[PDB]
């Protein structure tokens, strides 16, 4: 899915390759751009959770 809630900035190429959910994103494609994305908010979480893996803080 790679669901970013942003990129209103610059790229209609980003628009296409996002709205199609392009499973690939080329590096050479990236090198020709600046400020690709910043998922910057203060709202909620994404693809992660905390309070598990009992090994760490038991060691």
């Amino acid at each position: 899915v790679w669901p970013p809630l942003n990129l209103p900035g610059n790229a209609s190429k980003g628009l296409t390759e996002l709205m199609n959910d392009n499973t690939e994103i080329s590096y050479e494609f990236t090198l020709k751009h600046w400020k690709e994305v910043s998922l910057i908010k203060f709202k909620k979480c994404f693809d992660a959770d905390a309070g598990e893996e009992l090994s760490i803080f038991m060691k």
Binding site: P8, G9, N10, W34, K35, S38
Partner: peptide, 25 residues
């Protein structure tokens, strides 16, 4: 002449993008 509307649109959105970059700090 009427192409200038989309020209200034994309240019000003690029400018707001630059403003975000400035917010980068």
């Amino acid at each position: 002449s009427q192409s200038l509307i989309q020209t200034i649109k994309n240019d000003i959105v690029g400018l707001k993008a630059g403003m975000a970059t400035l917010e980068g700090m």
